[PDB]
């Protein structure tokens, strides 16, 4: 049950408690619901790599108090 | 007139980085040795000294770079992507090159609604700015943001530079307030920093690199425009399309 911080580029930080083996989709969707953002309009990043909704903290070797970077989706 | 990559497999998010790297004086000085950056600049110069032969030499090193990024970036050839994600992953492949870009700063925040304040030191190669103040300047690098304690909006968070690397890059979600790049030059602890290149975000789906040449003119490296580049008398991208800005220390 690790604690994760989801940090947006505006300086916002949202704390989340999550189990190591549950997929991050529930975290992502809840962050979008809290901030009023669209899943299609933002990207999540951990340790420089984009993270999918199927990813789990254990698969990405996340530790307690680690940080996920949220970006407005700007691809091309 | 310099050479550039041609568009293919939606690799504009990578071509724009490659053009910026090969025209960096500090990078060229450091690389000049089985480095991927040495291979990049050697193949580019080998191509720049000379149309299909040029494309093959440029495509080989681009492919090698893409394959190096693939595990970290988790993309498939032909996927769209962002240089904001790709640029630092490329730099982290070699610590001796990444050191040229790693600057130290601190995020300074102070809410006016409640008392919440913090000052957190970080070390990054590419920081993102959104909703910058109209007076935004590298020496006054502030933007509007919410407060995590009371949810008040339009508070200000400020980047306080502490140690600037020879190359200094920033990403702007909505661009810069204006596009006269001379006003964003700055000294920091005795060293001059000038904008030498800019990555433009066009139509929210395409990246193009602009290079400052010695005579003060500019070079547009739009990979759609074939192997050659285009010379412009002065800078031209709309301010809201200024995506990544590259400062380089002047020697
Ligand atoms: Ca240059
Ligand atoms: Cl130059
Ligand atoms: Zn507050």
Residue numbers in the entry:
A (entry chain B): 16 to 91
B (entry chain A): 225 to 256, 262 to 279, 301 to 501
Copied sentences from the primary study:
Ub/Ubl protein conjugation can be reversed by specialized isopeptidases termed deubiquitinases (DUBs) or Ubl proteases, which antagonize Ub/Ubl-mediated post-translational modifications. Moreover, we focused on recently structurally characterized USPL1, which is the only deSUMOylase with a USP fold but for which its mechanism for SUMO paralogue specificity had remained unclear. USPL1 featured an approximately 25-fold higher activity for SUMO2 over SUMO1, which suggests a much more pronounced paralogue specificity as previously assumed from fluorogenic reagents. We structurally and biochemically explain this substrate selection, as USPL1 uses the USP fingers subdomain to contact the Gly27/Gly26 loop of SUMO2/3 to discriminate against SUMO1.
Taking inspiration from Ubiquitin- and ISG15-processing USP-substrate complexes, we semisynthetically obtained SUMO activity-based probes that contain a reactive warhead at the protein’s C-terminus. SUMO2 and SUMO3 feature identical Ubl folds and differ only in their unstructured N-terminal extensions. We prepared a SUMO3–2Br probe with a 2-bromoethyl warhead as well as a ΔN-SUMO2/3-PA probe equipped with a propargylamine warhead. Both probes reacted covalently with USPL1 as evident from a shift in molecular weight and led to pronounced protein stabilization as assessed by protein melting temperature analysis, indicative of the specific recognition of SUMO by USPL1. We solved crystal structures of USPL1 in covalent complex with ΔN-SUMO2/3-PA to 2.4 Å resolution, as well as of USPL1 in complex with SUMO3–2Br to 2.17 Å resolution in a different crystal form. The latter structure featured two almost identical copies in the asymmetric unit and was used for single-wavelength anomalous dispersion measurements with a selenomethionine-containing SUMO3–2Br probe. Alignment of the catalytic triad Cys236, His456, and Asp472 in the SUMO3–2Br probe-bound structure was observed, and the importance of the respective residues for enzymatic activity as well as probe reactivity was confirmed by mutation. Alignment of three independently obtained relative arrangements of the USPL1 and SUMO folds revealed near-identical positioning of SUMO in these highly conserved areas including the SUMO C-terminus, the Pro66 loop, as well as the Gly27 loop in the fingers. Strikingly, mutation of Gly27 into serine abolished USPL1 activity completely, in line with Gly27’s central structural role in anchoring of the SUMO fold into the USPL1 fingers.
